[PDB]
């Protein structure tokens, strides 16, 4: 029974990059949460944006979809995704593009971004990105998996919860 000393140390970074949606595009680096990393790995690009073309209602079914892929650590990687930039001007730019064309997107629309990632060589899917905006699941699970990492960003800073699942 421990923890860890520096939160950040407790949550790495495995991702950096941008996101895309519409003509807009985020800075962000993805802290990684809970379930299996290797899904991160094989379903982000090397750290092209990730473009959001797609989304999903955050409506009962969808959502429930979602929680069953999450009941098996194996089956599922939860990151957590916090603007960067530069330097302290950049972030700033950087932080506004991700609540105003991202987040405030996502909330007005009631939705979860969509990333299909392929397998190369497959037509199939093969993984899918779930982002979610500041809202009642990712407020649920963070709360259940990061209390701590929860406390640090709720009503504080802009982030994305992006769910990642083998389909």
């Not at 730019?93 to 009631?110: C, N, R, V």
């Not at 990333?115 to 699970?141: D, R, T």
């Not at 960003?153 to 982030?159: D, G, L, Q, Y």
Request: charged share 15%; hydrophobic share 45%; proline share 8%.
């Amino acid at each position: 029974p421990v923890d860890m000393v520096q939160l950040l140390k407790k949550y790495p970074i495995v991702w950096q990059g941008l996101l895309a949606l519409k003509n807009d595009t985020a800075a962000v680096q993805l802290h990684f949460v809970s379930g299996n990393n290797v899904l991160a790995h094989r379903s982000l690009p090397l750290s092209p944006p990730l473009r959001i073309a797609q989304r999903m209602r955050l409506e009962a079914t969808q959502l429930e979809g979602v929680a069953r892929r999450m009941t098996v650590e194996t089956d599922y990687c939860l990151l957590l995704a916090l603007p960067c930039g530069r330097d302290q001007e950049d972030v700033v730019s950087q932080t506004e593009s991700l609540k105003a064309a991202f987040i405030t997107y996502l909330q007005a629309k009631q939705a979860a971004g969509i990333i299909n990632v392929p397998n190369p060589g497959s037509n199939q899917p093969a993984y899918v990105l779930q982002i979610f905006p500041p809202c009642e699941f990712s407020e649920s699970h963070l709360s259940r998996l990061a209390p701590d990492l929860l406390a640090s960003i709720s009503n504080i800073s802009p982030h994305l919860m992006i769910v990642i699942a083998s389909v």
